[PDB]
């Protein structure tokens, strides 16, 4: 579950926090995919 997919529906604040963490990790991965040294 991530905030990148709008189809995600958080049921409670716990799932909301987990989704935030997953979104941060996914953006980290995307940044390294788009990084070109």
């Amino acid at each position: 579950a991530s905030l990148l997919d709008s189809n995600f529906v958080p049921i409670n604040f716990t799932e909301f926090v987990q989704a935030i963490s997953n979104t941060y990790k996914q953006r980290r991965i995307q940044f390294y995919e788009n990084l070109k040294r």
């Binding site: 905030l3 049921i11 604040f13 909301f16 935030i20 979104t23 941060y24 953006r27 991965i29």
Partner: protein, 313 residues
Amino acid sequence: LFDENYYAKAVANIIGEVKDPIMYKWFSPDQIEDVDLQMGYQKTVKWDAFLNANPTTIANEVNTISTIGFSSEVVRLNYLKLQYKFRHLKQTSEKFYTSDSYIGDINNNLLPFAQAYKLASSEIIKLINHFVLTGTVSIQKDGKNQKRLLPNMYGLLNMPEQIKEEVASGDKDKMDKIFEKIEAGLSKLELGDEFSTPMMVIVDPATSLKLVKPYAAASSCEKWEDVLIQTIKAINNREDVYIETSNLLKHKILIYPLNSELIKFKPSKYMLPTPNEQVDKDSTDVAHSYIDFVLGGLLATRKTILQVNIKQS
């Protein structure tokens, strides 16, 4: 949840605008691994062997023989939870505070929740980057009045048992003197069998300015940066050398390998700012909110980081 919690909905709709941390550039994708923990510690056990004396010559009869000893070390990484509070306008009261082209009271510096959260998160991410680079938490340019952190919580610049070189105060203008200290530290580095890895260099803006001058009559083709890249390539076996400039540094040069076997960053999965469920509400238009974040999780081997400090006296 989003049908009941406007603040949660606003955070979900605003989280995209918050920019990525710049510390990701200082590491490789294989050097960052998340750990599921807010506050606490993680342990790692490493075994080692050593020779207690010269070997024994086996001739005729002898039963007193030199011994080989063993040792175990436990490396502990601490993770600490931190929080900030900020004030904002209440959602029901935002209508009376909207204006022609903006929402918020300029006279009292009151903001809508989304904008306040975004700005606070940006500031907290700046603080996190400063911690990861230097290993200290402070809000003063002097660097005093620091927060007392737990032991075994270090950054790239204050990690103990690493190579440290100091350029004298009277030699701060001499780039050749600086390069002499850098070369001495590079020689003293001990990468072992994991030497073949890309290397990372972080410099201050002034040093970046000094690096573009021609190598020393002066050479007409090569610069000090090119000489530095060749020198580091000599010890990393002609692997890539990446150079970065950070305004956070002041007259300090950091050189370290981008190898997960030597340096590994295991941050908490809750390290980056996260909203708290508690919201303070009164009969007025002002409300308060809280942001949580976790610090800690840098692991390095001994004598794998070169730290060059140029005295400015």
